[PDB]
């Protein structure tokens, strides 16, 4: 039937839509600013609101995935964004916002963000992680896209923010409609495959579930999330206090955007070559020692930029392992349910992370406390994800008895 690159087209146009979404609210700081007397912090409320609902959301989308088929789940999702980003173009109030772009969008976004995620390896055992990095690379896309296209809306005369708003909510909900309509795993029996009495079998959402293994990856989760989105929102600052012009800060920290878009396929390629433990803790490390390197190479445009990239390449490197490794321990037939569950770790960072790492700074006045804070969720994150070895497969006597 389809060729198997289809899944990770469409898991490409989809996660594309996601980073989209989750890109938007920086685009409507200053336009909301400017109309009403708006906060930053207020309308960085909305996009805390929509990471803590995306990221939970994400549960219930997987287990109906698994339930009910992919293709339902991600077109309902592109729905309830549509709905909720176009909404946020008629709104009036704070609270609105939070409504619409923060709870209905968002609510579409985890719809549409997991599904594929847990379909597109399905086409893929020979190319697990790499298929998995197709089903997120567009969440590093959607700033790229959003950005020009937002900034062209705004500024057009007979156009506006709302405008945004309005037309960027039909473009996502048609996109997200397009790759939520060819979404769907293999058929129930034969796998695509060139190449490929004891009898193993995946483990099952409540098997998973109440696995010791599937918590420790949940606490790394938390741990990486976190301490990236805690710092993340800091690096330019850390630039310009240490003496650069705010042009060359953001212009250093700005690689970022690239090597968080290209771990997500690299960083599968290379798991699919080599395995996913070592390299895995290996980032952990190098970002415990991002943290702590940024007061020694933070103060140039050349050092804060390499601590940016690592920073990029250990964060968004997560989005992909944490789901391979998921795979590799638990198998594809619950991944939905499974993964669903554990992006769940990923809403909490993302609600709380940003807001601590800014009163952590804003207390002391100094970063140290928020980079030696995350410095330390990523050296847990590293024992953790080091020390933590595959599950024991399943034996299947149900199936195993057939034999005679
Ligand atoms: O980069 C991603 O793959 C998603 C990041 C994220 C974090 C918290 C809530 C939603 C999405």
């Known amino acids: 039937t389809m060729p198997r690159w289809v899944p990770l087209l469409l898991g490409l146009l989809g996660s594309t839509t996601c980073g989209m979404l989750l890109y938007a609210w920086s685009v409507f700081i200053k336009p909301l600013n400017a109309e009403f007397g708006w906060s930053r912090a207020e309308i960085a409320m909305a996009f805390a609101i929509c990471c803590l609902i995306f990221g939970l959301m994400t549960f219930p989308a997987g287990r109906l995935s698994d339930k009910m088929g992919p293709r339902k789940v991600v077109m309902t999702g592109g729905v ?13 109030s704070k609270y609105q916002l939070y409504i619409t772009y923060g709870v209905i969008a968002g609510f579409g976004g985890g719809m549409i963000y997991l599904p594929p995620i847990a379909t597109a390896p399905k086409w893929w055992p020979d190319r697990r992680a790499l298929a998995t990095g197709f089903a997120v690379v567009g969440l590093g896309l959607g700033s790229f ?105 953001a212009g250093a920290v700005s690689s970022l955007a690239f090597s968080n878009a290209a771990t997500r396929i690299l960083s599968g390629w290379f798991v699919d070559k080599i395995g996913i433990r070592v390299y895995f803790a290996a980032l952990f490390a190098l970002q415990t020692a991002a943290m702590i ?75 140290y406390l928020p980079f030696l804070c995350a410095a330390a969720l990523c050296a847990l994150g590293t024992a953790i994800v080091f020390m933590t070895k595959p599950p024991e497969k399943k034996h299947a006597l149900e199936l195993e008895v057939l034999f005679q």
């Open 80 to 92: 309830l964004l549509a709905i909720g980003f176009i909404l946020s173009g008629f709104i009036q």
């Open 145 to 249: 896209l959003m950005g020009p296209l937002a900034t062209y809306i705004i500024e057009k005369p007979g156009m506006g923010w709302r405008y945004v708003f309005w037309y960027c909510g039909v473009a996502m909900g048609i996109m997200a409609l397009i790759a939520g309509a060819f979404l769907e795993p293999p058929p129930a029996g034969w796998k695509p495959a060139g190449y490929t009495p004891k009898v193993t079998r995946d483990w099952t959402y409540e098997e998973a579930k109440g696995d010791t293994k599937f918590w420790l990856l949940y606490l790394a989760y938390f741990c990486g999330s976190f301490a990236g989105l805690m710092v993340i929102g800091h690096l330019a600052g850390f630039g310009r206090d240490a003496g650069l012009t705010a042009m060359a800060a």
């Open 293 to 367: 390197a940024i007061f020694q190479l933070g103060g140039s445009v050349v050092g804060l930029s390499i601590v940016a990239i690592v920073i990029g390449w250990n964060y968004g490197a997560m989005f992909t392992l944490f789901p391979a490794t998921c795979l590799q321990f638990y198998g594809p037939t619950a991944q939905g349910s499974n993964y669903g569950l554990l992006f769940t770790a990923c809403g909490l960072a993302g609600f709380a992370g940003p807001w601590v790492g800014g009163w952590l700074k804003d207390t002391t006045g100094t970063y």
